[PDB]
Amino acid sequence: NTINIAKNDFSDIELAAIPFNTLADHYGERLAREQLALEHESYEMGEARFRKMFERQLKAGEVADNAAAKPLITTLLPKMIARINDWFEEVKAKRGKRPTAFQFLQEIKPEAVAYITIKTTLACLTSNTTVQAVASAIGRAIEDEARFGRIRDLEAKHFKKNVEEQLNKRVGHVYKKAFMQVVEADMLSKGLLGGEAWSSWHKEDSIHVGVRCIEMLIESTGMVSLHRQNAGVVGQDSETIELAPEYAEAIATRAGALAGISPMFQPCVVPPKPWTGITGGGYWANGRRPLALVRTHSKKALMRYEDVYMPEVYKAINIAQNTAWKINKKVLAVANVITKWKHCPVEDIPAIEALTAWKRAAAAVYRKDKARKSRRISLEFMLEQANKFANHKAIWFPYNMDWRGRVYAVSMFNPQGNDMTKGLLTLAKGKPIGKEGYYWLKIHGANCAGVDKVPFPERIKFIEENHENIMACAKSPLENTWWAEQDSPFCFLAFCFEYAGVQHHGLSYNCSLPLAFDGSCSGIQHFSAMLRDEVGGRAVNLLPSETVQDIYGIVAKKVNEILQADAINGTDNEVVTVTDENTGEISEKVKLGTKALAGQWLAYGVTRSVTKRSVMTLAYGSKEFGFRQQVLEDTIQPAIDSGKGLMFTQPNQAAGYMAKLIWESVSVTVVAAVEAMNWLKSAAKLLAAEVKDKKTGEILRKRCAVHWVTPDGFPVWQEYKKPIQTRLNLMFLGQFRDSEIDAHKQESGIAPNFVHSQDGSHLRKTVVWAHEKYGIESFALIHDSFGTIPADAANLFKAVRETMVDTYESCDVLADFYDQFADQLHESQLDKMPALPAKGNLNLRDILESDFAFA
DNA sequence: GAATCGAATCGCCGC
RNA sequence: GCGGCGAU
DNA sequence: CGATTC
Ligand SMILES: O=Cc1cccn1[C@@H]1O[C@H](COP(=O)(O)OP(=O)(O)OP(=O)(O)O)[C@@H](O)[C@H]1O
Ligand SMILES: [Mg+2]
Ligand SMILES: [Mg+2]
Numbered sequence: 002n003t004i005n006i007a008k009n010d011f012s013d014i015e016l017a018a019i020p021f022n023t024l025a026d027h028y029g030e031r032l033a034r035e036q037l038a039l040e041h042e043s044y045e046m047g048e049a050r051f052r053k054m055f056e057r058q059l060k061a062g063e064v065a066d067n068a069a070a071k072p073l074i075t076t077l078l079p080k081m082i083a084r085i086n087d088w089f090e091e092v093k094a095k096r097g098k099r100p101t102a103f104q105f106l107q108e109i110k111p112e113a114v115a116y117i118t119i120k121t122t123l124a125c126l127t128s129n130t131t132v133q134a135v136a137s138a139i140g141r142a143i144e145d146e147a148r149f150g151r152i153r154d155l156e157a158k159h160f161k162k163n164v165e166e167q168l169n170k171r172v173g174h175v176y177k178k179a180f181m182q183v184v185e186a187d188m189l190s191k192g193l194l195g196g197e198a199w200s201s202w203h204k205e206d207s208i209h210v211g212v213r214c215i216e217m218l219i220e221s222t223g224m225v226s227l228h229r230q231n232a233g234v235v236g237q238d239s240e241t242i243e244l245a246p247e248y249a250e251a252i253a254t255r256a257g258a259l260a261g262i263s264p265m266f267q268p269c270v271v272p273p274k275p276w277t278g279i280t281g282g283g284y285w286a287n288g289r290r291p292l293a294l295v296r297t298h299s300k301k302a303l304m305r306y307e308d309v310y311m312p313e314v315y316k317a318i319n320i321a322q323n324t325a326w327k328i329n330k331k332v333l334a335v336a337n338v339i340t341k342w343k344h345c346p347v348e349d350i351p352a353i354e355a356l357t358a359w360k361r362a363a364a365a366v367y368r369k370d371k372a373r374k375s376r377r378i379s380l381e382f383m384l385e386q387a388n389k390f391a392n393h394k395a396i397w398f399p400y401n402m403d404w405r406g407r408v409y410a411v412s413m414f415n416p417q418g419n420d421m422t423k424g425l426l427t428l429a430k431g432k433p434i435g436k437e438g439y440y441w442l443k444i445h446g447a448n449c450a451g452v453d454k455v456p457f458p459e460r461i462k463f464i465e466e467n468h469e470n471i472m473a474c475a476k477s478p479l480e481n482t483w484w485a486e487q488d489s490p491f492c493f494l495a496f497c498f499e500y501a502g503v504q505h506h507g508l509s510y511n512c513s514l515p516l517a518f519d520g521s522c523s524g525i526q527h528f529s530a531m532l533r534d535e536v537g538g539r540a541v542n543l544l545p546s547e548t549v550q551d552i553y554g555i556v557a558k559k560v561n562e563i564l565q566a567d568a569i570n571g572t573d574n575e576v577v578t579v580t581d582e583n584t585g586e587i588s589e590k591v592k593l594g595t596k597a598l599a600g601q602w603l604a605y606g607v608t609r610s611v612t613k614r615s616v617m618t619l620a621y622g623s624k625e626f627g628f629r630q631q632v633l634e635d636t637i638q639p640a641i642d643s644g645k646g647l648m649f650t651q652p653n654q655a656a657g658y659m660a661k662l663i664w665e666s667v668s669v670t671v672v673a674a675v676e677a678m679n680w681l682k683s684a685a686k687l688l689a690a691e692v693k694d695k696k697t698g699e700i701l702r703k704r705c706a707v708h709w710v711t712p713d714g715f716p717v718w719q720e721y722k723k724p725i726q727t728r729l730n731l732m733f734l735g736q737f738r739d740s741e742i743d744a745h746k747q748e749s750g751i752a753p754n755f756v757h758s759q760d761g762s763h764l765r766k767t768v769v770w771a772h773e774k775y776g777i778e779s780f781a782l783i784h785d786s787f788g789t790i791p792a793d794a795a796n797l798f799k800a801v802r803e804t805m806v807d808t809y810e811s812c813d814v815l816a817d818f819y820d821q822f823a824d825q826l827h828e829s830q831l832d833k834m835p836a837l838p839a840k841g842n843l844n845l846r847d848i849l850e851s852d853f854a855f856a
Numbered sequence: 857g858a859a860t861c862g863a864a865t866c867g868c869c870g871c
Numbered sequence: 872g873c874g875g876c877g878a879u
Numbered sequence: 880c881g882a883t884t885c
Contacts, residue, residue, distance in 0.1 A: 066871075622864070627863060745861090753864035756864090
């Protein structure tokens with residue numbers, strides 16, 4: 002039931018003359034044919050991908066989950082619900098005893114029966130056409146939502162949350178229902194569902210409820226026609242159900258239309274098409290899916306950039322596209338061997354509360370089995386793409402941006418991937434390495450091993466002390482597994498081959514390995530530079546420092562100062578009344594004081610591992626509440642499951658105490674970060690407010706989106722939007738039944754999105770400034786990682802600091818942010834707008850002399 | 857007034 | 872949307 | 880612990 006788009010639509014891509022000539026005028030006809038054939042293959046692979054998924058969803062009875070059937074379902078559902086309703090009054094107004102199926106259909110609300118019927122008849126017809134068997138299919142599906150939705154809807158709307166996540170962790174209808182069977186029995190043992198065990202429907206009841214549902218679908222919609230066979234013959238009287246061909250052609254056309262616009266983007270064998278406008282950049286042919294400069298969730302948001310003059314933004318994207326890459330054949334030769342022997346090549350190298358705790362161990366193996374299969378899937382695809390382009394002289398990647406302006410490569414195989422993917426990709430246009438390039442090659446090799454918390458001379462000494470090990474790895478990587486045991490193994494191996502090249506050829510050796518420089522904590526770095534935070538900036542190495550500054554260990558050091566103070570002074574333990582709000586029981590337990598809680602943590606030993614997740618999620622918006630879950634999940638629970646954690650008698654009390662100390666430490670260490678996110682959150686709060694006079698009720702000021710402009714000239718609009726109603730069932734997944742600004746997501750998004758737009762602007766300005774003031778042509782970019790060939794590494798090191806000093810010396814981005822929305826504020830809320838946070842004593846020009854900023 | 861909720865972006869794979 | 876993986 | 884909304 003599908004139409005091959007490929008025969009005509011995909012043929013136009015190679016045939017059309019205006020795309021061919023514009024490509025051939027730059028790189029000739031031979032490369033033009035190769036590039037168009039590659040893009041043609043990408044669309045063909047994408048069509049094949051959709052069709053395999055469509056047929057697998059066809060075979061599994063999940064055809065309503067496919068995107069080609071959703072536009073159908075959304076116009077048939079309101080008619081079904083109106084007819085599902087309208088029956089109920091007719092039988093209630095018709096005297097006499099009710100039909101067999103009337104009472105069952107009241108146990109499930111009209112919306113849920115409308116979807117359950119449509120999905121199950123679509124499943125039964127596509128994947129026996131008798132009305133009896135399709136009636137029982139709905140009948141067993143209605144009863145499942147009736148019996149087990151009882152748990153969700155009424156008795157445990159608070160306690161469902163403690164089984165909702167573990168229900169979602171199960172995959173498969175059988176596993177999900179079996180878990181719900183255990184949940185229902187556990188609840189009844191506590192008298193939670195009213196003590197009423199379900200009386201399962203008889204098979205006679207299940208067929209009769211279905212034929213009521215099929216008949217009501219024919220009345221409301223024309224999706225399905227009824228057909229009788231051998232009418233009047235007692236033995237062979239049957240009714241066969243049929244999907245209406247006019248609606249089958251609707252999903253067929255939509256399946257073909259969607260199959261054309263889902264290509265598998267690949268690297269380019271010619272340089273990518275320079276961006277001159279909103280669309281059509283990157284790849285060279287026109288396409289069923291043309292590339293967009295900004296990845297927006299709506300076509301209206303992309304059209305906002307049409308006449309936006311942002312020349313520096315366009316130059317930055319086009320320069321990055323022009324960077325020539327090639328597959329690292331030496332690394333690829335190694336990876337082609339060890340992936341045949343291990344599922345993950347660097348995974349396991351040989352080297353020298355009982356119910357509720359071991360339930361988590363069982364869930365750990367279940368999660369690990371998912372993780373092992375997931376990691377292997379991506380590994381085999383990356384290796385296939387790397388081998389496909391291995392013998393090419395150079396390959397290129399097109400680039401675009403997310404709606405905040407961060408720069409992303411477009412192809413699935415691209416240098417922004419994991420350690421193996423980065424290890425398989427090297428720059429194509431190298432230069433003689435020289436003395437300076439060799440020095441930075443060793444620094445880059447030291448960072449791949451994980452020796453990055455020590456000053457530069459110690460990184461050099463680590464490489465020079467391990468000179469024998471590095472040369473042994475380059476000469477025979479399969480015979481010496483030392484490279485595989487490092488923090489970034491394949492990138493370390495890539496350094497090993499280049500290091501051996503300098504030994505075999507001297508400083509004239511042409512090297513093209515990308516040497517990445519990663520900023521410490523980019524979000525905190527930008528916030529500290531915004532408000533001139535001396536203490537906060539020094540913690541993220543903005544300032545020149547003795548050693549590499551480690552904000553994870555600084556917070557841990559501050560945490561341990563409170564722990565030892567709380568171990569001498571501090572509160573004692575106390576008994577306090579507690580009450581479970583569900584059961585209503587009033588009990589009394591021990592509330593551990595800070596003196597006891599500090600002693601437990603001092604026994605455990607609080608290091609940077611305890612604090613690392615909390616500050617890492619600070620820029621994402623986490624705070625003292627979120628830290629409690631992080632500490633419980635990352636530190637306390639792994640300790641208890643491994644025989645440690647004997648000090649933690651009440652883990653939630655230890656977690657909440659730890660979250661209080663981390664939040665006190667982080668909010669005192671990086672002050673300007675905390676103040677800046679608070680100010681932006683308050684800004685979005687007043688913008689997303691629908692202010693109104695309560696007496697009149699009239700809307701005085703409409704809720705407003707948040708809009709600002711980066712120093713590079715890239716504009717960004719934040720308008721999180723929410724749907725008005727959505728329905729989710731238990732065994733079968735959710736489905737839609739206009740949009741308004743989601744004010745909650747506006748508050749939760751504004752601070753991370755603002756700082757991410759700033760680091761995108763900084764990256765783009767770095768790429769431009771490095772390309773024009775110096776002569777750098779090759780760029781490796783992952784959002785805050787700046788890499789180039791070793792001979793240009795020192796200049797990139799200088800350029801990335803010069804741009805960051807330049808913007809914040811010239812732009813008050815928070816004050817510029819204020820100048821945008823201040824006209825949109827209402828009279829009643831300007832008094833409640835907090836003032837801009839005060840700037841500090843940090844001198845921005847010290848960033849130029851900072852060794853470990855890297856950015 | 858309480859009653860409830862809530863506590864970054866992007867891409868791939870699966871349902 | 873949910874499950875898992877990866878990138879910052 | 881605040882905002883948002885019953
Ligand atoms: O971006 C987030 C991200 C995505 C994937 C992995 N990560 C984290 O990136 C860290 C490495 O950078 P750091 O933050 O400096 O950690 P570290 O312990 O101090 O240094 P290291 O020993 O790993 O070399 C890792 O640990 C991860 O949590
Ligand atoms: Mg690290
Ligand atoms: Mg990160």
